[PDB]
Design an enzyme around this catalytic site. Structure first.
Site, short mmCIF file in Angstrom:
data_model
loop_
_atom_site.label_atom_id
_atom_site.label_comp_id
_atom_site.label_asym_id
_atom_site.label_seq_id
_atom_site.Cartn_x
_atom_site.Cartn_y
_atom_site.Cartn_z
CB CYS A 1 -1.01 0.03 1.21
SG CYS A 1 -0.22 -0.69 3.01
CG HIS B 1 -4.19 0.35 4.09
ND1 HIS B 1 -3.42 -0.52 3.55
CD2 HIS B 1 -5.17 0.87 3.29
CE1 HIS B 1 -3.91 -0.73 2.37
NE2 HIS B 1 -4.86 0.10 1.79
CG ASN C 1 -8.02 0.35 -0.19
OD1 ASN C 1 -6.57 0.45 -0.06
ND2 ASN C 1 -8.82 -0.26 0.68
O1 HNQ Z 1 -6.48 -7.57 1.64
N1 HNQ Z 1 -5.85 -7.18 2.34
O2 HNQ Z 1 -6.56 -7.23 3.60
C1 HNQ Z 1 -4.97 -6.59 2.62
C2 HNQ Z 1 -4.88 -5.44 3.01
C3 HNQ Z 1 -3.51 -4.75 3.28
C4 HNQ Z 1 -2.48 -5.26 2.77
O3 HNQ Z 1 -1.38 -4.66 2.82
C5 HNQ Z 1 -2.72 -6.55 2.29
N2 HNQ Z 1 -1.44 -7.27 1.74
C6 HNQ Z 1 -1.54 -8.14 1.33
C7 HNQ Z 1 -2.81 -9.00 1.15
C8 HNQ Z 1 -3.82 -8.49 1.66
C9 HNQ Z 1 -3.62 -7.12 2.05
#
Ligand code: HNQ
Length: 256
Positions: free
Chosen positions: A31, A201, A221
């Site tokens: 992210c 995030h 997002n």
């Molecule tokens: O989907 N997710 O929940 C999620 C959120 C945030 C992240 O950085 C993620 N990275 C890998 C897989 C899922 C992730």
């Protein structure tokens, strides 16, 4: 015009496809890199009056920044991402299997807490290698393909300052504390009501508006389009909610 009640970068820069774009970080905590490259993309097109419109590569930034940026797929830091763009620059690169640009994303799309046909997102995978080469069939060299930032900066914890920065220079990268109810977001303005803190995030902020008297920021997002509101969400603006106004970063593309 001295800050209108609502502003959406897609409407201000209609010739910039990237602003309208939702990407997918895949099973990787990238992210920090997506909000960065998404905004860099947007600003490149804004800075050049759409004369240059490319997908900046999350892959280049995520694999090559190195320790400066943190730990690849294990999370990273926005401020250091933009700083890395001002010094080493970033090549173009599109979506998974897009064959777009120099270094397309190599991590497959997955479902991020939603129902779909792609495999569910598993954890944070491994970080790919930094390979300074472009895909076959991309004519310019990786070196010639780099887009540098003239500068990078942290915008103050100030709503007015954040709006003025987006208004004049384009979308920004920001970050906030994710509580469990954010995973469940579907539409409308997100405001934290229940749930525990799940760490932070990173995201792209591209506007602001007012929903029934409730001021909000327009955010992208990196969890694909089937998550939230076609991949975007809205969040309370003016209250430094979940720290939405504390970690704002941006910068100006280097012209040359
Ligand atoms: O989907 N997710 O929940 C999620 C959120 C945030 C992240 O950085 C993620 N990275 C890998 C897989 C899922 C992730």
């Amino acid at each position: 015009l001295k800050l209108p009640a609502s502003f959406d970068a897609r409407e201000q820069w209609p010739q910039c496809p990237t602003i309208k774009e939702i990407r997918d970080q895949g099973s990787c905590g990238s992210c920090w890199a997506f909000g960065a490259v998404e905004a860099i993309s947007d600003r490149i097109c804004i800075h050049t009056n759409a004369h240059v419109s490319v997908e900046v590569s999350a892959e280049d930034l995520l694999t090559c920044c190195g320790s400066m940026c943190g730990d690849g797929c294990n999370g990273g830091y926005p401020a250091e991402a933009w700083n890395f763009w001002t010094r080493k620059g970033l090549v173009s690169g599109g979506l998974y299997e897009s064959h777009v640009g120099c270094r397309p994303y190599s991590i497959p799309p997955c479902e991020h807490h939603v129902n779909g046909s792609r495999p569910p997102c598993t954890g944070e995978g491994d970080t790919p290698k930094c390979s300074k080469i472009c895909e076959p069939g991309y004519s310019p060299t990786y070196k010639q393909d780099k887009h540098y930032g003239y500068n990078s900066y942290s915008v103050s914890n100030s709503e007015k300052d954040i709006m003025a920065e987006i208004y004049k220079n384009g979308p920004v990268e920001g970050a906030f504390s994710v509580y469990s109810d954010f995973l469940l977001y579907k539409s409308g303005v997100y405001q934290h009501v229940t749930g525990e803190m799940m760490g932070g995030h990173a995201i792209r902020i591209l506007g602001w508006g007012v929903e029934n008297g409730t001021p909000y920021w327009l955010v992208a997002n990196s969890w694909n389009t089937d998550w939230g509101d076609n991949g975007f969400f809205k969040i309370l603006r003016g209250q430094d909610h979940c720290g939405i106004e504390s970690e704002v970063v941006a910068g100006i593309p280097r012209t040359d």
